Amino acid sequence: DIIWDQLIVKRTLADLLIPINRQISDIQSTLSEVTTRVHEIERQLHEITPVLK
Amino acid sequence: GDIIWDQLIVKRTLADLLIPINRQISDIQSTLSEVTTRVHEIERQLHEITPV
Amino acid sequence: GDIIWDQLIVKRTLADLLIPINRQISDIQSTLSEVTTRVHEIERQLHEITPVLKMGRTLEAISKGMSEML
């Protein structure tokens, strides 16, 4: 019927979109982690420029 | 034949819309890996001077 | 166009539903460009300050050491 056609169409799209969505979410989390590490480095560099003079 | 055909047409037209998405993602992944390596080297360098 | 007309309507529908993917990718690309710039500035700052710190520490070690000899 129409309700099973939707499920087959949906699963056919998912064969391609699930991996793109997975790749994007893993990039987003790694990029958020890197931004946090870079923020902490800027905080550390700020605390050690007083010792220069 | 009806549904198998429809799925193949739908899949193939989407797959080609994704070709540039896949290229963009692979280029992000390599740049992000390069940035993570540069940030790790900065953390090791900065640990050799962070005590007091 | 029988299946060619169907492919072009499906293609135009799918292209408009992929806009969130394009938006997500655009926003990743700009954030990644911004951190690469922040990472570049940190590398130049560590290059210029660390020879100053190692020398300033050496000079303090000589000054303390030699003031206590004399």
Number of other residues whose CB lies within 10 A of the CB of residue A39 = 12
* Residue A18, phi then psi, degrees to nearest 5: -55, -55
Sequence positions preceding breaks in chain A, C–N over 2.5 Å: none
Query: From CA C52, how far away is CA A52, in angstroms rounded?
Result: 7
Rounded distance, CA C3 to CA B52, Å? 72
| b/e sequence C8-37, b meaning 16+ C-beta within 10 Å | eebbeebeeebeebeebbeebeeebeebee
Local structure of C13: helix, strand or coil = helix
Those residues whose C-beta lies under 8 Å from the C-beta of residue C10, and which sit 6 or more positions away, are B9, B10, B13
Torsion C44-A44-C33-B45 (CA) sign: positive
Distance, in Å, from the CA atom of B8 to the CA atom of B18, rounded to the nearest integer, reads 15
Contact (CB, 8 A) for C18 and B17 = yes
Mutate to test the interface with B, among A38, A51, A52 (most CBs of B within 10 A): A38
Q: Is A23 on the interface with B (CB under 8 A)?
A: yes
Domain count of the fold of chain A:
1
Structural domain that includes position B15: 1-52
CA distance B48 to A47: 15
Name every residue whose Cβ is closer than 8 Å to that of residue B35 and which is 6 or more positions away in sequence: A34, C32, C35, C36, C39
**Residue at token pair 């793109």:** A20
* C23 inside 8 A of chain A by CB: no
Q: Do C53 and A52 touch (CB under 8 A)?
A: yes
For chain C, count helices (H), then strands (E).
2, 0
Resolution limit, Å: 2.0
Distance, CA of C40 to CA of C48 (rounded, Å): 13
Query: Per the structure block, which two tokens stand in for A48?
Result: 């050690």
Q: How was this structure determined?
A: X-ray
Token pair in block for residue B48: 């050799």
- Is the distance from CB of A12 to CB of B10 less than 8 angstroms? yes
Pairwise CB contact (< 8 Å): C32 & A31 = yes
Q: From residue A41, give the alpha-carbon distance in Å to each of A44, B50, C38.
A: 5, 10, 10
